Short mmCIF file of N, CA, C and O in Angstrom, two decimals:
data_model
loop_
_atom_site.label_atom_id
_atom_site.label_comp_id
_atom_site.label_asym_id
_atom_site.label_seq_id
_atom_site.Cartn_x
_atom_site.Cartn_y
_atom_site.Cartn_z
N UNK A 1 -4.66 6.31 1.63
CA UNK A 1 -3.42 6.24 0.92
C UNK A 1 -2.50 5.14 1.47
O UNK A 1 -1.83 4.46 0.70
N UNK A 2 -2.48 4.97 2.80
CA UNK A 2 -1.60 3.97 3.39
C UNK A 2 -1.87 2.60 2.75
O UNK A 2 -0.95 1.87 2.36
N UNK A 3 -3.15 2.23 2.65
CA UNK A 3 -3.49 0.92 2.07
C UNK A 3 -3.05 0.82 0.61
O UNK A 3 -2.58 -0.24 0.17
N UNK A 4 -3.24 1.91 -0.14
CA UNK A 4 -2.90 1.97 -1.55
C UNK A 4 -1.40 1.64 -1.75
O UNK A 4 -0.99 1.08 -2.77
N UNK A 5 -0.58 2.05 -0.78
CA UNK A 5 0.85 1.73 -0.83
C UNK A 5 1.17 0.35 -0.25
O UNK A 5 1.97 -0.41 -0.83
N UNK A 6 0.57 0.05 0.90
CA UNK A 6 0.85 -1.15 1.68
C UNK A 6 0.57 -2.44 0.90
O UNK A 6 1.09 -3.51 1.23
N UNK A 7 -0.27 -2.34 -0.14
CA UNK A 7 -0.57 -3.51 -0.95
C UNK A 7 0.70 -4.18 -1.49
O UNK A 7 0.68 -5.39 -1.77
N UNK A 8 1.79 -3.41 -1.65
CA UNK A 8 3.07 -3.93 -2.12
C UNK A 8 3.56 -5.13 -1.27
O UNK A 8 4.34 -5.96 -1.74
N UNK A 9 3.11 -5.23 -0.04
CA UNK A 9 3.58 -6.30 0.83
C UNK A 9 2.52 -7.38 1.02
O UNK A 9 2.73 -8.34 1.76
#
Protein backbone atom coordinates (compact mmCIF):
# COMPACT_ATOMS: atom_id res chain seq x y z
CA UNK A 1 0.00 0.00 0.00
CA UNK A 2 2.80 2.45 0.83
CA UNK A 3 4.08 2.30 -2.77
CA UNK A 4 0.54 2.63 -4.16
CA UNK A 5 0.33 6.00 -2.36
CA UNK A 6 3.97 7.12 -2.63
CA UNK A 7 3.71 7.18 -6.44
CA UNK A 8 2.19 10.68 -6.00
CA UNK A 9 5.74 11.98 -5.46
